[PDB]
Amino acid sequence: AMSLENVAFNVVNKGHFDGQQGEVPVSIINNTVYTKVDGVDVELFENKTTLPVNVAFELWAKRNIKPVPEVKILNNLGVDIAANTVIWDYKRDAPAHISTIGVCSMTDIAKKPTETICAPLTVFFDGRVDGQVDLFRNARNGVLITEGSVKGLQPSVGPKQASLNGVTLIGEAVKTQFNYYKKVDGVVQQLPETYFTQSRNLQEFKPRSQMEIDFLELAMDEFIERYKLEGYAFEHIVYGDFSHSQLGGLHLLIGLAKRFKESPFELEDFIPMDSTVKNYFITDAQTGSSKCVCSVIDLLLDDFVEIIKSQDLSVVSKVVKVTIDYTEISFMLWCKDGHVETFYPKLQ
Amino acid sequence: AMSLENVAFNVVNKGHFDGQQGEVPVSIINNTVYTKVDGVDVELFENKTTLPVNVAFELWAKRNIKPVPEVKILNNLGVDIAANTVIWDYKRDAPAHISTIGVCSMTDIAKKPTETICAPLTVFFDGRVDGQVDLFRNARNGVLITEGSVKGLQPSVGPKQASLNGVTLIGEAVKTQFNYYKKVDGVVQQLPETYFTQSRNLQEFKPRSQMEIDFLELAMDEFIERYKLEGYAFEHIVYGDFSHSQLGGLHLLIGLAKRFKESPFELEDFIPMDSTVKNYFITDAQTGSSKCVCSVIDLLLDDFVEIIKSQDLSVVSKVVKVTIDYTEISFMLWCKDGHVETFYPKLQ
Amino acid sequence: AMSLENVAFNVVNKGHFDGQQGEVPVSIINNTVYTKVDGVDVELFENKTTLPVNVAFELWAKRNIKPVPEVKILNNLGVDIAANTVIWDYKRDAPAHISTIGVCSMTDIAKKPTETICAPLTVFFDGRVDGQVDLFRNARNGVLITEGSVKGLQPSVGPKQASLNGVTLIGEAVKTQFNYYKKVDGVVQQLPETYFTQSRNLQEFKPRSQMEIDFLELAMDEFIERYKLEGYAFEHIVYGDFSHSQLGGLHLLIGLAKRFKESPFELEDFIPMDSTVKNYFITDAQTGSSKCVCSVIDLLLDDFVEIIKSQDLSVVSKVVKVTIDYTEISFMLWCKDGHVETFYPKLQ
Amino acid sequence: AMSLENVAFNVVNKGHFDGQQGEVPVSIINNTVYTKVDGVDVELFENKTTLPVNVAFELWAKRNIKPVPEVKILNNLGVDIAANTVIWDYKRDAPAHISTIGVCSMTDIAKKPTETICAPLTVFFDGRVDGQVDLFRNARNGVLITEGSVKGLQPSVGPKQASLNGVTLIGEAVKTQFNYYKKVDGVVQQLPETYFTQSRNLQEFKPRSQMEIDFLELAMDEFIERYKLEGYAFEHIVYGDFSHSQLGGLHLLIGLAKRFKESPFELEDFIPMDSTVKNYFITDAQTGSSKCVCSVIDLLLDDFVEIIKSQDLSVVSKVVKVTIDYTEISFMLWCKDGHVETFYPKLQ
Amino acid sequence: AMSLENVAFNVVNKGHFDGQQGEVPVSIINNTVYTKVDGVDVELFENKTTLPVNVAFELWAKRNIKPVPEVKILNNLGVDIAANTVIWDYKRDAPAHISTIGVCSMTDIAKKPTETICAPLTVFFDGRVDGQVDLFRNARNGVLITEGSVKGLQPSVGPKQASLNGVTLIGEAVKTQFNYYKKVDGVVQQLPETYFTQSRNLQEFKPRSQMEIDFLELAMDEFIERYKLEGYAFEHIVYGDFSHSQLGGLHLLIGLAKRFKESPFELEDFIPMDSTVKNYFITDAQTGSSKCVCSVIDLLLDDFVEIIKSQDLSVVSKVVKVTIDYTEISFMLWCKDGHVETFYPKLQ
């Protein structure tokens, strides 16, 4: 018995859609859902999606309120749709996937993921939901997450962190470390060995290793010396070069996080979405040093150090491919006389 | 001589509507009022109400710029409309009442509160305005506020704080403590003995008593011991329980304010309006502990302590009714073997 | 080969319009430009202007990404249009000028500033662009900025600071100090001797002179005594008077910046645009002291002190005219028995 | 090199999209595409679809301008998408199918109908386009139309009429009679024996048989007598019954067209779309006789007469199923003592 | 004392803006101006322009309600703006010119046409308004219309018809034949010898000459024979050729009006604006014969006959330039062995 007034009743009384019966007066004005409370209209939801107001309302209301894989991870695995849930992209304030399976009448392509229509799509299955594991086994294309083992299937350990109601976190009171499984054209696929991004903010940045604690605490010449990083262009790549009109390096988030503490800067996030490599239009307030496309990756410093030190510095320029968040990240490695000049992740 | 271009003239030249004569070029695009300044369009107002753009503009312009009762208080007293003013709800960015009395042509139901049409409505009268007290005496239903005594009428002392241009404050340079009076079907009504909420923010929270200073300063086991709060589930009710997937207790704002200092958390205010009991969808960033409907009341700790200690802990579950902000707040009191288990305010 | 899909390609791949060939799928919904990335719509731009969505998109994309004069300065010089660029007003999130010259088909009045149509307009020329200086020489009305000397023309040294991608800054890695030149009806005009506003924020305020360091550090009676400011109403004019319902003085930004550190206050910027004199509707949270139109100017204290001390305190009230940011700022000077009572900049 | 400004260039210069190179200035306001002509904005297209303005613009521009099957026919055959064209539904002012195949970047699911994604969809193929017949032969699901024979496949002769730019017509200067072919799960399907609706206007109605010429020229009792239609409730079913508050019968278009010739009535088309059975809320201006759901089918009278005379009138009420426009139309047949009472098509 | 509520008062009470004092309650929702009448909102104006709702409202309200030159004529003469009036384009439901002179604050570039800003623009002056003739004499660029002679200036007799409140008519109770005068760079210009379009409707078409009365009454072969039009491709050019898929000829309105009398067709006016040559996407319902760009000109037959008979039929294809409505209309003349094949006006 699905209806606008019912979804709104659940939003008012329960915080989200919770299958409760009841109705509340609703009015729709300028991409906004309002409800009459004490004789006045109160804003329930402001549609920031490309779907009709009432549709987006229902999908938001019916969003997954448990720790779920970060959108970047799902996208990288080629997930097209979710089985009997809505993965809400809090970075875009919109559903992470266009269509649904047994969620809402206006967006559903099927009621069950077993319908012939779902076969060409990579359907996301949540092992924590009863019967979803068997649905993955029976689907032509899909991605499966589980808290534990799945009899017979070879697991891929995923990132430590998951998104819980927009908050990316490493679960203490909840489990955020899942086991990943993927199928392509009815065949289980062996996922690669991968590094994971840490998903940290510029402002609330915290080191996650001793070498990262040493980075923010120690001086430039001091840190390079301690971790034998001489001739690896750490000066340029990580810390940044603000001496000229075009901002030099500054491709690791830890680097941006150190500089932000000294003096602020504008980070124009011109493609606001979740991705392994982010591109920002940076402008330094102190210096005037700016760069239109500054590619930033949040790799744990120790991982970046392992990657850079694992390269052959004999050629002027080459493409270095690194498996990060289950996707191939192309990095440009620029060298000169056996030392690094620059090493930036590519946009792609 | 009321007009759009005149209201805009006053907004530009005086900050709000101030009865000044004059006009400025105005353009209306996408629920926004613009004015031409130095040959370009400057944004005067962005309509966030359910009223037409130009109407909301006028009501906002004509808002009360003196300390006025907080919307929660007015709503609790059953105020339907205001006499010859606009009470602006800064929490909703909209007028607190749908219709007006001698304010604007498009929203006025009457020019004067004495019109037969106003009789069934509880009209708000401001004693500080000449002739308003006599209008209350002559109205069938109403709420009156005064700075001082009203000959013959029995007063109800209101909260210490009032809202001045969106800022809730206890007046130093202005009076924010009013005397309340109410009429129902032409009869003066004796308002009840009530406790008042403190109307504090999560982030800019400040203790207002020694016991509240002791709460934020002292440790858990230390505070309970000092104020003889043993077996009153203060651990659960006030401080919060983040050990499991569902967040335990945390119903007093002072509690949320202590936790916010240690580690941040998301407070999803899903019904954004002013009320005695607020409901939030809380998610703890550190733990992963979350709760869809967490009812929060900002009572001065000493008042909450007086309320909890004034109860009979002999029965498993009962409804405890407390007069707060002139309304009956139903509280659920859960007990076991002569001690408290939990005590939360109900949504209602 | 100018098109929506191409502008969007450049925005995605390069951060702004950079003359690159290529196209990306674009969709236009509710004054917003979206692009399909990984099968979902991502928000590229939210039109906050009075121009059509796609037009504003192009003008924003084609904005000047070099340090440019602050909009207040350009407006004061009477600039109507810019030659072959877009000066973006980041304070209004809109183009600083209605029409363009060789930028966009929908807003262009001419392709080149030499067209007969441009003659009555004061066209902005950027000396740093090849051929622009000669275009100024040949234009009937205009404003020219250069980093260096222009053979034969008498220069006017401009402010130390410029706006770089919305950030107002004194350039270290870039030049922000330009030479100004102006033409009126084909004749070079001698610009006046002027003081410049410092363009500082309330929250990130920093002193720019010893006397300003002394202001924030020292006490009221202490500072007045040290800088011989007795009988200049510095108490009232700069620091502010919060004792009564109407807020007294507080017309210099440094004054507001000191008070903000002690206790916060609401600054309602009711005409959000860049100007030499700003008007705010101030409300003090601590006191309840408020004022609808509080005129605020950010003059370096030493400059304000030079201005106030340079006046004749013999008459009750007079208009004091001060050249600030190339415009005449009328100040009201109120006196009594050879001392100052108040000295505020006028709205105008 | 697909772009908004190019599509608009083709619309202006050629009438629709015709692969021509060039651009025109375009502005998007509301849900309307405008172009600057002689310095003013001219309306090119008003988006009446649920797709973004610029997307719908492109699909409209890229519509099929040849005689194509009427949307009702395609829907009845279960067509989901069209191969390398856009079938425009002029009754809904929107594309007849949500997604496209090699038409537009924002709606394309595939570039070619051979992609694995298209397999579950019934793809429409136009034999008149080179290589489309062979694409049908290799597609899993599909509908094919041809002007002539297809080696090996058994044809189904379709309706005499087709829609040419919104005009439903029987082609004289063009061919509108096609041969239909259908595939389901890789198997050619033998289409049923069907009657076709005539797709006539109530206003511009033209008889297509002698019995229709007789119906319009002759009197009621006269016609019934000539074509031996006694006891077949023709008076009720075909001509209307306006004697009571609820309008009796009037289910055949010729009947409506005859009444309209005499007295006009209101036909509220509450589900505006193309269908075999249409439902109207009729209100007769002469009599005041009205009916909420009056199901109307435009069958050639001779066909209706063949259908009604081919029934068993022994039972009070039964469902009569008639193959019309390749779909099963359920008709309710109401009888009494061996004669007809009423016979209406079901809405569904 | 110009304001929204005043303009609306005049619209309600007087039909348009008539300088009357008074105000009416107005509400603006979407792009529509409403007024409260008997307690309900009544639609005054639906903005179909690219200007803000309230601005377009004022310009519409302030439109010229006297017979004025048809927009096509003004455009052809290169009129950019009108002096102290608004010429409303009823074909576009928008003002014919972007800016105004002493009409509305939001669109005015000047208060009087004598301002230096107006000099580069061709300003329209109406001789029937006091002092306008003298303003033309002193303006640098302009177009003047008068009912009578102007001392010293040589007149150009204009079309017989003018637009009176959207109705194009030859005045009986009013004068619609004006005298045209034009100035370019301060010099009076001698306007060319021109033919005029008749500006007739396809539906309400009326013959304006005996040869037009003969065209409509007589048969094809009959007419051609009577007016010695053999070998001038009249059959093709004037009457249509509906025998093939692409509609042949049909470039003269009288020809369309004759066909429409017999069989109806769809005329898709894809560039809805006033022009000398109109382009339609025609689809003949009888034959199915269609053409994307069918250029149609409404020339009095006798004029067309004079034009075609005045050509040299010796070359296969050439551009024939005809002065129509003061502009050069390029016509394509296609010939073969001394006779005409086709002769169509060019779209451009």
Coordinates of C-alpha atoms in Angstrom, one line a residue, chain A:
Chain A
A1 CA 0.0 0.0 0.0
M2 CA 2.7 2.4 -1.2
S3 CA 1.9 6.2 -1.4
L4 CA 3.4 9.7 -1.0
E5 CA 1.4 10.5 2.2
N6 CA 2.5 7.1 3.7
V7 CA 6.2 7.6 2.9
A8 CA 5.9 11.1 4.6
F9 CA 4.1 9.5 7.6
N10 CA 7.1 7.1 8.1
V11 CA 9.6 10.0 7.5
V12 CA 7.8 12.1 10.2
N13 CA 7.2 9.3 12.7
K14 CA 10.2 7.0 12.2
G15 CA 13.0 9.0 10.5
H16 CA 12.9 7.1 7.2
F17 CA 10.6 4.5 5.4
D18 CA 9.9 1.7 7.9
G19 CA 6.8 -0.1 6.5
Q20 CA 4.5 1.7 9.0
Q21 CA 0.8 2.3 8.1
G22 CA -0.6 5.8 8.3
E23 CA -0.8 9.1 6.3
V24 CA 0.2 12.8 6.8
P25 CA -1.0 15.8 4.7
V26 CA 1.7 16.6 2.1
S27 CA 2.2 19.5 -0.4
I28 CA 4.6 19.7 -3.2
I29 CA 6.0 23.1 -4.2
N30 CA 9.3 24.1 -6.0
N31 CA 11.1 20.5 -5.9
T32 CA 10.3 20.4 -2.2
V33 CA 8.1 18.0 -0.1
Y34 CA 6.3 19.8 2.8
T35 CA 4.0 18.4 5.6
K36 CA 1.4 20.4 7.6
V37 CA 2.5 20.4 11.3
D38 CA 0.7 22.8 13.8
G39 CA -1.1 24.4 10.8
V40 CA 2.1 25.3 8.9
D41 CA 4.2 23.8 6.1
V42 CA 7.5 22.1 7.3
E43 CA 10.2 21.1 4.8
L44 CA 10.6 17.3 4.8
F45 CA 12.9 17.0 1.7
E46 CA 14.5 19.3 -1.0
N47 CA 14.9 17.3 -4.2
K48 CA 18.5 17.7 -5.4
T49 CA 18.2 14.8 -7.9
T50 CA 17.2 14.6 -11.7
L51 CA 14.2 12.4 -10.8
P52 CA 10.7 13.8 -10.1
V53 CA 10.4 15.3 -6.6
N54 CA 8.0 12.6 -5.2
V55 CA 10.1 9.8 -6.7
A56 CA 13.4 11.0 -5.2
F57 CA 11.5 11.5 -1.9
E58 CA 10.5 7.8 -1.8
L59 CA 14.1 6.6 -2.8
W60 CA 15.7 8.8 -0.2
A61 CA 13.1 7.6 2.4
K62 CA 13.9 4.0 1.4
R63 CA 17.7 4.5 1.5
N64 CA 20.0 1.8 3.2
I65 CA 20.6 2.9 6.8
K66 CA 23.2 0.2 7.5
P67 CA 27.0 0.5 6.8
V68 CA 27.2 0.0 3.0
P69 CA 30.2 0.0 0.5
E70 CA 31.3 3.5 -0.5
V71 CA 29.9 4.6 -3.9
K72 CA 33.5 4.8 -5.3
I73 CA 34.0 1.1 -4.6
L74 CA 30.6 0.1 -6.1
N75 CA 31.3 2.2 -9.3
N76 CA 34.8 0.7 -9.6
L77 CA 33.3 -2.8 -9.5
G78 CA 30.8 -1.8 -12.3
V79 CA 27.6 -2.1 -10.1
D80 CA 24.6 -0.8 -12.2
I81 CA 21.7 -1.4 -9.8
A82 CA 21.0 -2.7 -6.3
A83 CA 18.8 -5.7 -5.3
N84 CA 15.9 -4.7 -3.1
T85 CA 17.5 -1.5 -1.6
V86 CA 18.5 2.1 -2.4
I87 CA 22.2 3.0 -2.1
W88 CA 22.1 6.8 -1.4
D89 CA 25.0 8.9 -2.7
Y90 CA 25.3 11.5 0.1
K91 CA 28.0 13.3 -1.9
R92 CA 25.6 14.0 -4.8
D93 CA 22.4 14.0 -2.6
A94 CA 20.9 11.5 -5.2
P95 CA 20.5 7.7 -5.6
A96 CA 23.8 6.1 -6.6
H97 CA 21.9 4.1 -9.3
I98 CA 19.2 5.3 -11.8
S99 CA 16.8 2.2 -11.6
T100 CA 15.6 0.0 -8.7
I101 CA 14.5 -3.7 -8.1
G102 CA 11.5 -4.0 -5.8
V103 CA 11.8 -0.6 -4.2
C104 CA 9.6 2.0 -5.9
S105 CA 7.0 1.7 -8.7
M106 CA 8.3 4.7 -10.7
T107 CA 12.0 3.4 -10.8
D108 CA 11.6 -0.4 -10.6
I109 CA 12.7 -2.3 -13.7
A110 CA 11.8 -5.6 -11.9
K111 CA 10.2 -6.7 -8.6
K112 CA 12.9 -9.4 -8.1
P113 CA 16.5 -9.5 -9.3
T114 CA 15.8 -12.9 -11.0
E115 CA 13.7 -11.2 -13.8
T116 CA 15.2 -11.6 -17.3
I117 CA 15.5 -7.8 -17.6
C118 CA 18.2 -7.7 -14.8
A119 CA 20.5 -10.3 -16.5
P120 CA 22.7 -7.8 -18.4
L121 CA 23.1 -5.6 -15.3
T122 CA 25.7 -6.0 -12.5
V123 CA 23.3 -6.2 -9.5
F124 CA 24.5 -5.4 -6.0
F125 CA 23.6 -8.1 -3.4
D126 CA 23.9 -7.6 0.4
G127 CA 24.8 -10.9 2.1
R128 CA 23.4 -9.6 5.4
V129 CA 19.9 -9.7 3.9
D130 CA 18.2 -13.2 3.9
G131 CA 18.2 -14.9 0.5
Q132 CA 20.5 -12.4 -1.3
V133 CA 23.6 -14.8 -1.4
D134 CA 21.5 -17.4 -3.4
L135 CA 20.2 -14.6 -5.7
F136 CA 23.9 -13.7 -6.5
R137 CA 24.6 -17.4 -7.3
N138 CA 21.6 -17.3 -9.7
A139 CA 22.2 -13.9 -11.3
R140 CA 24.2 -13.5 -14.6
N141 CA 26.1 -10.4 -13.5
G142 CA 26.6 -9.1 -9.9
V143 CA 28.6 -7.9 -6.9
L144 CA 28.2 -9.5 -3.5
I145 CA 29.3 -8.3 0.0
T146 CA 29.2 -10.5 3.1
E147 CA 30.3 -10.1 6.7
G148 CA 31.6 -13.8 6.6
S149 CA 32.5 -16.7 4.3
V150 CA 30.3 -18.0 1.5
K151 CA 30.5 -21.8 1.0
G152 CA 32.8 -22.5 -2.1
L153 CA 33.3 -18.9 -3.3
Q154 CA 36.8 -17.4 -3.1
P155 CA 36.7 -14.0 -1.2
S156 CA 38.3 -10.6 -1.7
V157 CA 38.8 -8.7 1.5
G158 CA 37.5 -5.1 1.0
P159 CA 38.2 -1.8 2.6
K160 CA 38.2 -1.3 6.4
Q161 CA 35.6 1.6 6.1
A162 CA 32.0 1.8 4.9
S163 CA 29.5 4.7 4.6
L164 CA 26.8 4.7 7.4
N165 CA 24.2 7.4 6.7
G166 CA 26.7 9.6 4.8
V167 CA 29.4 9.1 7.5
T168 CA 32.5 7.1 6.2
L169 CA 33.8 5.1 9.1
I170 CA 35.7 2.1 10.4
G171 CA 33.0 0.2 12.4
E172 CA 33.4 -0.4 16.2
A173 CA 29.8 -1.1 17.1
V174 CA 29.1 -2.3 13.5
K175 CA 31.0 -4.3 10.9
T176 CA 32.3 -2.2 7.9
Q177 CA 34.9 -4.8 6.5
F178 CA 33.1 -6.9 3.9
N179 CA 34.0 -9.8 1.6
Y180 CA 33.6 -8.9 -2.1
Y181 CA 32.5 -11.3 -4.8
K182 CA 31.9 -10.5 -8.5
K183 CA 30.2 -12.3 -11.4
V184 CA 30.5 -11.5 -15.2
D185 CA 28.4 -13.4 -17.7
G186 CA 27.5 -16.1 -15.2
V187 CA 31.1 -16.8 -14.1
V188 CA 32.6 -15.9 -10.7
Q189 CA 35.5 -13.5 -11.3
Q190 CA 38.8 -13.4 -9.4
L191 CA 39.1 -9.8 -8.1
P192 CA 42.6 -8.3 -8.2
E193 CA 45.1 -7.5 -5.4
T194 CA 44.4 -3.9 -4.5
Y195 CA 45.4 -0.9 -2.3
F196 CA 42.5 1.1 -0.8
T197 CA 42.1 4.9 -0.5
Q198 CA 41.6 6.0 3.2
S199 CA 38.6 8.3 2.4
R200 CA 39.7 11.2 4.7
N201 CA 38.6 14.9 4.7
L202 CA 41.0 17.9 4.2
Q203 CA 40.0 19.5 7.5
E204 CA 39.4 16.5 9.9
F205 CA 42.5 14.7 8.7
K206 CA 44.1 12.3 11.1
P207 CA 47.3 10.2 10.5
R208 CA 46.7 6.4 10.3
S209 CA 50.3 5.2 10.7
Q210 CA 53.6 6.2 12.4
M211 CA 55.1 7.4 9.1
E212 CA 52.0 9.6 8.6
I213 CA 52.3 10.9 12.2
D214 CA 56.0 11.7 11.4
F215 CA 54.9 13.6 8.2
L216 CA 52.6 16.2 9.9
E217 CA 54.9 16.5 13.0
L218 CA 58.4 16.5 11.4
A219 CA 60.0 19.0 9.0
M220 CA 60.5 18.5 5.2
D221 CA 64.3 17.8 5.2
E222 CA 63.9 15.8 8.5
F223 CA 61.1 13.4 7.2
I224 CA 62.8 12.6 3.8
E225 CA 66.1 11.8 5.8
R226 CA 64.3 9.4 8.3
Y227 CA 62.4 7.4 5.7
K228 CA 65.3 7.3 3.1
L229 CA 63.1 9.2 0.6
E230 CA 66.0 11.1 -1.0
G231 CA 65.7 11.6 -4.8
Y232 CA 61.9 10.5 -4.8
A233 CA 60.6 14.1 -5.4
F234 CA 58.6 14.0 -2.1
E235 CA 59.3 17.7 -1.8
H236 CA 57.3 18.3 -5.0
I237 CA 54.8 15.3 -5.2
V238 CA 53.5 15.3 -1.6
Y239 CA 54.2 18.7 0.2
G240 CA 53.5 21.0 -2.9
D241 CA 55.4 23.8 -4.6
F242 CA 53.8 27.2 -4.2
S243 CA 56.8 29.4 -5.4
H244 CA 55.4 29.9 -9.0
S245 CA 52.0 30.9 -10.6
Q246 CA 51.2 27.2 -11.4
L247 CA 51.0 25.1 -8.2
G248 CA 53.6 22.2 -8.3
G249 CA 52.7 18.7 -7.2
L250 CA 50.5 18.3 -4.1
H251 CA 48.8 15.0 -5.2
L252 CA 48.5 13.1 -1.9
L253 CA 45.8 14.2 0.5
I254 CA 48.2 14.0 3.5
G255 CA 50.2 16.8 1.7
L256 CA 47.1 19.1 1.3
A257 CA 46.2 18.4 5.0
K258 CA 49.6 19.6 6.3
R259 CA 49.5 22.9 4.2
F260 CA 45.8 23.6 5.3
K261 CA 47.0 23.7 8.9
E262 CA 49.7 26.4 8.0
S263 CA 47.5 28.6 5.8
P264 CA 44.0 28.0 4.2
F265 CA 43.3 27.5 0.4
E266 CA 40.3 27.1 -1.9
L267 CA 39.6 23.6 -3.1
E268 CA 37.1 23.9 -6.0
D269 CA 35.6 20.3 -6.4
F270 CA 34.3 20.8 -10.0
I271 CA 33.1 17.2 -10.5
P272 CA 31.3 16.6 -7.1
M273 CA 31.1 12.8 -6.9
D274 CA 32.8 9.9 -5.1
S275 CA 36.0 8.7 -6.9
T276 CA 39.4 7.1 -6.2
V277 CA 41.2 10.1 -7.9
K278 CA 39.6 13.5 -7.2
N279 CA 40.3 16.6 -9.3
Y280 CA 40.3 20.0 -7.7
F281 CA 40.9 23.6 -8.9
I282 CA 43.2 24.7 -6.1
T283 CA 44.1 28.4 -5.3
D284 CA 46.5 29.3 -2.5
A285 CA 45.3 32.3 -0.5
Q286 CA 48.8 33.1 1.0
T287 CA 50.8 32.8 -2.3
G288 CA 48.4 33.2 -5.2
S289 CA 49.8 29.9 -6.6
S290 CA 46.9 28.1 -8.4
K291 CA 46.3 25.0 -10.6
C292 CA 43.0 24.1 -12.6
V293 CA 43.4 20.3 -12.4
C294 CA 45.2 19.1 -9.3
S295 CA 44.6 15.3 -9.1
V296 CA 44.5 14.2 -5.4
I297 CA 44.5 10.6 -4.1
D298 CA 44.2 9.7 -0.4
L299 CA 46.5 6.7 -0.1
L300 CA 48.0 5.8 3.3
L301 CA 51.6 7.3 3.0
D302 CA 53.2 3.9 3.7
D303 CA 51.3 2.5 0.6
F304 CA 52.3 5.5 -1.6
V305 CA 56.0 5.0 -0.4
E306 CA 55.7 1.3 -1.3
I307 CA 54.4 2.2 -4.8
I308 CA 56.9 5.0 -5.6
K309 CA 59.9 2.9 -4.3
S310 CA 58.7 -0.1 -6.4
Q311 CA 59.4 1.8 -9.7
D312 CA 62.2 1.8 -12.3
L313 CA 63.5 5.4 -12.6
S314 CA 65.6 4.8 -15.8
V315 CA 63.1 6.4 -18.3
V316 CA 62.0 10.1 -18.7
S317 CA 58.3 9.3 -18.8
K318 CA 56.1 6.2 -18.4
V319 CA 52.6 5.1 -17.3
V320 CA 52.6 3.3 -13.9
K321 CA 49.4 1.3 -13.3
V322 CA 48.4 0.7 -9.7
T323 CA 45.3 -1.3 -8.6
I324 CA 43.5 1.0 -6.2
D325 CA 39.9 0.4 -5.0
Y326 CA 39.6 -2.5 -7.5
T327 CA 40.3 -0.2 -10.5
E328 CA 43.5 0.4 -12.6
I329 CA 44.8 3.8 -11.7
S330 CA 47.3 5.1 -14.4
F331 CA 50.0 7.3 -12.8
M332 CA 52.4 9.4 -14.8
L333 CA 56.0 8.9 -13.6
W334 CA 58.5 11.6 -14.7
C335 CA 62.2 11.0 -14.1
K336 CA 65.7 12.5 -14.8
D337 CA 69.2 11.0 -14.2
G338 CA 68.0 8.1 -11.9
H339 CA 65.7 10.3 -9.6
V340 CA 62.0 11.2 -9.6
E341 CA 60.8 14.6 -11.0
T342 CA 57.0 14.1 -10.5
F343 CA 54.5 11.2 -10.0
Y344 CA 50.8 12.2 -10.3
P345 CA 47.6 10.1 -10.6
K346 CA 45.8 10.5 -14.0
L347 CA 42.3 12.1 -14.1
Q348 CA 40.7 8.9 -16.0

